[PDB]
Amino acid sequence: ALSLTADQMVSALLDAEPPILYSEYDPTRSMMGLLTNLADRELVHMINWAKRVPGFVDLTLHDQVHLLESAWLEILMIGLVWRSMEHPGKLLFAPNLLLDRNQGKSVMVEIFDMLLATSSRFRMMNLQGEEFVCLKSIILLNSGVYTFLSSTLKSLEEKDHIHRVLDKITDTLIHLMAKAGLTLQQQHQRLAQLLLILSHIRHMSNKGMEHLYSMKSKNVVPSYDLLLEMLDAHR
Amino acid sequence: ALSLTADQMVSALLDAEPPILYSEYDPTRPFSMMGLLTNLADRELVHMINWAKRVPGFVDLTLHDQVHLLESAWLEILMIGLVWRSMEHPGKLLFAPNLLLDRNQGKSVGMVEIFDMLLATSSRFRMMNLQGEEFVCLKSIILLNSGVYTFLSSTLKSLEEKDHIHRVLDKITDTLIHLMAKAGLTLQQQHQRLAQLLLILSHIRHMSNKGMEHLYSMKSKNVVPSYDLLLEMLD
Ligand SMILES: Oc1ccc2c(c1)CC[C@H](c1ccccc1)[C@@H]2c1ccc(OCCN2CCCC2)cc1
Ligand SMILES: Oc1ccc2c(c1)CC[C@H](c1ccccc1)[C@@H]2c1ccc(OCCN2CCCC2)cc1
């Protein structure tokens, strides 16, 4: 896992990409309903993607669940922002569900606006697909790593492993930038620009989690046990 | 500001550092908690405004954008300051030199949750052996980055403002790399450490959101600094 080359890391991540799902509605002849149904179906595929992120299945089941519990909304969001990049002023939730900010005003527009701004920022930077899949894996590995409130020997080893995998993704990002002919200065500047966007994505997830919690619906935040069930796969 | 050398940037940030304040209580009296922390935070905010104006490039911005940046970043900046001065006190948070608290003392006034996250950040700083020069760079990055994706304006002036902010952020990136090269780190180690440092900022954003949630939940008129209060201090 930690022996992969930069190109091999990229190929692994590109091959692991989840599919783009459609919204489920009768196109012949409810907004939050549609988004929730979409998000729920994406989550199943996200679990498959996560297990194919180099290093992720080396972790205990418990730590895998903790990471996904922390990162799942950030991952949905960065995927949406990536899909939306070439659609200025709109969010491509699905190919049959492309919404502008006005259509967010039915429940939400605050969140829509933050996502739209991220998409624009990605457009301004000319974010590449290879960079995107690196950033998405970084979110998965990083978002929950500081909240392992455990200091068992096992936990120390798990955190050390995660930071080693995060280092390899850093090396990989730098490599893609060197491959594109960027100077050393441009490389570290772009690395920093990309990573700083992750704090905003964290911010957006927190705002969105605040909404889901306020709905006071039993199933709207994925339980540890539900995440456990999807992750704890038999063979 | 964009013409400062790396060493000049560091010197300017080091000289701009705010003082360490004390908690205001009669130490001869029996040992409220939120009251002490709030009084401390309020007095720190005044010095924070002073610090911000000495961050190279910050006063080049419009008053309105300065307020926006501080509105977005002020709790993150208090938190990173806390985590930094707690670095050499494992298991404790050094709110002030006369107010060193462990997690059991956080349980008095949903605070232990926030205490635990702060403690974990301090431990992460400790393990990375974070340096003072690095810390002031990171704090400046928070000030400039946290609000830059939420200006929600695309006037010519706002385009110029965002461009300037990203140029200053780039210079701070250059500065961090130079500090690491000065310390003898290889190019690989430099990029990996830059990444490790910046990824911690997502967790600090997370912590600020959790804390803002508490302050808002108090329903007290002045506990979240208003736009116009920040404007008066920034005049
Ligand atoms: O590609 C995507 C599909 C749907 C979404 C997003 C990306 C980005 C955030 C969205 C959002 C809008 C308003 C409030 C909060 C978030 C929305 C979305 C809606 C609902 C969600 O949660 C539904 C609950 N559901 C239960 C288990 C997991 C999710 C997640 C995301
Ligand atoms: O060095 C510092 C002084 C005080 C603090 C911190 C750092 C870190 C977060 C703290 C916290 C504890 C519980 C909940 C939220 C945050 C607490 C703190 C307490 C109160 C605060 O807000 C008071 C309101 N006040 C009104 C204008 C500005 C702040 C901010 C930070």
CB A175 within 8 A of CB A8: no
B119 Cβ inside 6 Å of ligand 2: no
Sole residue written with tokens 């208090």: B78
Largest CA distance in chain B: 58
Pocket probe mutation, ligand 2, options B17, B24, B38, B67, max atoms within 8 Å of Cβ: B38
Domain count, chain A: 1
Method used to determine the 3D structure? X-ray
Element housing B230 (H / E):
helix B227-234
CB-nearest to A117 from B149, B176, B187 is B149
CB A112 within 8 A of CB A84: no
Contacts of B178 in chain A (CB under 8 A): none
Sole residue written with tokens 């004390």: B22
Q: Are residues A203 and B201, on separate chains, in Cβ contact within 8 Å?
A: no
Question: Helices B63-85 and B187-217 meet at what angle, rounded to 10?
Answer: 100
Q: Residue B71: CB partners within 8 Å, gap ≥ 6?
A: B147, B225, B227, B230
E-state strands within chain B:
92-96, 99-102
Resolution as reported, in Å? 1.8
Residues listed for chain B: 235
CB A221 within 8 A of CB A212: yes
SS3 label, residue B53: coil
Look up residue A201 and give its two tokens: 């994505």
CB A98 within 8 A of CB A87: yes
Q: How far is the CA of A31 from the centre of ligand 2 (A)?
A: 37
Residues A95, A82: Cα–Cα separation, whole Å? 13
- Find the angle CA(B53)-CA(B10)-CA(B149) to the nearest 5 degrees: 55
**Containing structural domain, residue B56:** 1-235
Q: Is B85 annotated as a binding residue?
A: yes
CATH number of the domain bearing residue A226 = 1.10.565.10
Could you give the residue ranges of the DSSP H alpha helices within chain A? 6-15, 31-51, 61-83, 109-125, 129-142, 153-179, 184-214, 224-231
Residues B133, B61: Cα–Cα separation, whole Å? 24
Q: Is B214 annotated as a binding residue?
A: yes
Cα→Cα distances A59→A55, A221, B70, Å: 7, 23, 39
Element housing B204 (H / E):
helix B187-217
Question: Hey, which residues 131-170 in chain A have their CB within 8 Å of chain B?
Answer: 138, 142-143, 146-147, 149, 163, 166-167, 170
Residues A143, A136: Cα–Cα separation, whole Å? 11
